[PDB]
Amino acid sequence: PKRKKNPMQLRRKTYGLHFKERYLKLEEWYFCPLCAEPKKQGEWCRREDCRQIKP
Amino acid sequence: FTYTQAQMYARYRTRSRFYKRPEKMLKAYNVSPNLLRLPKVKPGLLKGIYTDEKIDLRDRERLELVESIRHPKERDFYQDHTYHNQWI
Amino acid sequence: MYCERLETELQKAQDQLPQYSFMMKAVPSAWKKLDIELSVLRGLSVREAMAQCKLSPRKGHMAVFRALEVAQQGAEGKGLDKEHLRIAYITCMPGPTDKQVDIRSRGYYAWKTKKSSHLLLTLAEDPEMVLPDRTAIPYASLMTMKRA
Amino acid sequence: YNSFERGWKDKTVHPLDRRGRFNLDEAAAELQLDEAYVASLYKPLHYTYSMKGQRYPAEQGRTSRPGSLAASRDRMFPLYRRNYKLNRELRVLDHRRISTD
Amino acid sequence: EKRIDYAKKMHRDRRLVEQLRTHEFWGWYMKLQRVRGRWCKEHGVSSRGVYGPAVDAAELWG
Amino acid sequence: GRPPPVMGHAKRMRFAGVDDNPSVTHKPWDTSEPLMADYGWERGKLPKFRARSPFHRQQIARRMVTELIRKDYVIVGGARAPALRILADHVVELAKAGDTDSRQQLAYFLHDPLMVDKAFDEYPRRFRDMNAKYAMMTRLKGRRRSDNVAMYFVEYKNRDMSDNHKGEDYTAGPERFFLPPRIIETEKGIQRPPHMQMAFDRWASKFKTEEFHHWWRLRHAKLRYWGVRNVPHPSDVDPLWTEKEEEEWHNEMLANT
Numbered sequence A: 001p002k003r004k005k006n007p008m009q010l011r012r013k014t015y016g017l018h019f020k021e022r023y024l025k026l027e028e029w030y031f032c033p034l035c036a037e038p039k040k041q042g043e044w045c046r047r048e049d050c051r052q053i054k055p
Numbered sequence B: 001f002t003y004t005q006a007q008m009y010a011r012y013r014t015r016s017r018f019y020k021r022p023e024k025m026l027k028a029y030n031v032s033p034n035l036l037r038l039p040k041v042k043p044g045l046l047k048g049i050y051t052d053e054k055i056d057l058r059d060r061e062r063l064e065l066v067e068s069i070r071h072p073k074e075r076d077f078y079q080d081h082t083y084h085n086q087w088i
Numbered sequence C: 001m002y003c004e005r006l007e008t009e010l011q012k013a014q015d016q017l018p019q020y021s022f023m024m025k026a027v028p029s030a031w032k033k034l035d036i037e038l039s040v041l042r043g044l045s046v047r048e049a050m051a052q053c054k055l056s057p058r059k060g061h062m063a064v065f066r067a068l069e070v071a072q073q074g075a076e077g078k079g080l081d082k083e084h085l086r087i088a089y090i091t092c093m094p095g096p097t098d099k100q101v102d103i104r105s106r107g108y109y110a111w112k113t114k115k116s117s118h119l120l121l122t123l124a125e126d127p128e129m130v131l132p133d134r135t136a137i138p139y140a141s142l143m144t145m146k147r148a
Numbered sequence D: 001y002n003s004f005e006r007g008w009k010d011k012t013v014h015p016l017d018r019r020g021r022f023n024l025d026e027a028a029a030e031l032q033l034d035e036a037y038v039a040s041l042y043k044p045l046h047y048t049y050s051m052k053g054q055r056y057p058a059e060q061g062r063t064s065r066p067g068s069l070a071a072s073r074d075r076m077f078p079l080y081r082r083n084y085k086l087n088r089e090l091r092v093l094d095h096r097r098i099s100t101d
Numbered sequence E: 001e002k003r004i005d006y007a008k009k010m011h012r013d014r015r016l017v018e019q020l021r022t023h024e025f026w027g028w029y030m031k032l033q034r035v036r037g038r039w040c041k042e043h044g045v046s047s048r049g050v051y052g053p054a055v056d057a058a059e060l061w062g
Numbered sequence F: 001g002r003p004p005p006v007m008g009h010a011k012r013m014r015f016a017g018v019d020d021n022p023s024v025t026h027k028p029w030d031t032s033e034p035l036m037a038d039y040g041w042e043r044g045k046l047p048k049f050r051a052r053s054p055f056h057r058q059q060i061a062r063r064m065v066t067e068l069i070r071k072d073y074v075i076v077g078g079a080r081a082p083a084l085r086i087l088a089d090h091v092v093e094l095a096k097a098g099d100t101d102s103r104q105q106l107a108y109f110l111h112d113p114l115m116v117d118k119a120f121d122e123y124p125r126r127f128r129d130m131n132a133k134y135a136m137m138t139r140l141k142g143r144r145r146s147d148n149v150a151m152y153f154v155e156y157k158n159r160d161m162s163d164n165h166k167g168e169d170y171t172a173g174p175e176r177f178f179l180p181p182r183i184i185e186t187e188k189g190i191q192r193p194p195h196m197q198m199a200f201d202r203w204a205s206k207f208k209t210e211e212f213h214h215w216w217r218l219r220h221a222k223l224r225y226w227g228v229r230n231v232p233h234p235s236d237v238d239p240l241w242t243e244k245e246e247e248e249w250h251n252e253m254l255a256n257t
């Protein structure tokens, strides 16, 4: 770095689909019918009901 | 940033501010200059920062809540001593 | 008698609102990090914000989720709804920064500053907010299940 | 680590040495070896005899705190109190053994 | 010559008790293989695979 | 052309077909071999989870297999799970064969002898009719707090046909780690093979002393010297097992009375 960066240089950082996809993305979720807790798909609890039949 | 194909103004109080934080206006002779004109209403109500609960994690109450947050990898040392001899 | 009329009016002009402002301080995280993980939450139902937080393994989402269970715990006292409540402004506030000695190699020192922030959070109330039903696997309900 | 979240816990303490439960003093009675001595064999020699050793600071016990009383290094770690009879009897030379006049 | 007798005495009996722990662990382990030996006959678990002994009697691999 | 387009040796990638070509080099592209130290991202190799050395990785393959057999569930993390489930389908491929070649080829591999005494008894009874995929790799949801490594819950398949883990519950870990696991109340009337549950308390016997209650007190000083956040001081770490917790169990051995 032979120069300091004005914000418009620091701001380009936030446009590529690398910043956006890493930080600024909401996860798709739903309520685990057994635990009533929010949950992503493909993931389950450490619990017999959640483990035999994948909620 | 954010922007859902919608021109929400921007990132709010975030991207620009974190560039040059404003120097703190010091008191001369401990005086506050316009003290003798502005009302005495608590500053929580003057500019508008009116908060129902100012929960303070710098407290011995919430020491459990702080230790709930920090990452296990965030090792803190000198728990049971200090490098500088405290008895001097 | 004039500033006692303000401090009663400005107070009565602020609590009668459908808002609830709540500041958590010394959220042990810098502003660069903690704050960019807020702008995903700015403008979300609290039932969603309390969800998108509990999932992500980040620290910023676990700090705010510590509020969205305390703030609404206090919001429900103000009369504010438990359900229709929104996140109006969730902003990071630069806060206390310790100075720790660091000892670089070859007799050079460079002061690491253990950073800490403040978290300003304004739960507001959206009157007509329809809390969307979240009980169907995100979209396994289709394009994975055969047509009919 | 059957944890699902490692920590200062759920680190399976001895995933070997399954032959636990040694009754030292009971076994020391079979060998006729001064029960107080035998148990000292099985802890770092710092802890029993008058030897140069390295102690952890929490082990040292803190002053009387507002939260907790003065927790001396002994009343929390009884079996680590040095036994200076057992030291002297074994490690130091008594005036007696060299008394010549 | 007192701290020589001291050292040779802390080793001489670190085995004398190591000659009980492992000495008695074996003595106990053979209780285990006996109580396992007794239990594995009434419950009939031959502990030699999914097959019957007719795969053993050949004394091949199978 | 006449020689292979890419000569004798070149590493294609993860996610690449075999593209068989005339070559001198030897590639398995098949992994039916049981209890094998072939860790890699190829086809004939099971996934090489990270470790300091192919030796120390093998040492992690030991204490994670001997702890799946010991207790039929191990909450293993990351690329160890796809690397473990293939070692649970091998142990049964070792426990089914039965010949004294195999029972050693597992004796060489398990840190403890009682395991190779167990694995050959329950598994021929258990999996007499299952012929593959003996380990169920169900992923837990909350990625580790110490790093974003995922946590799968590899458990052996049917336990209702077992003899040691008949009706146990694994919804939560044992309270003190030397305490036997909670049992499904619908089958509370189950007793165990004695050699399994008499050697366990032989092991669990060392934590019921006070010398371990000193090593427990002490360890909490280490984790503070090494400063680990949220470690209670060794002054308020009152023992795991105690005399009040003694009276139940000696009177829970009413069988030998």
Ligand SMILES: [Zn+2]
Pocket: A032, A034, A035, A044, A045, A047, A050, A055
């Ligand atoms: Zn669940």
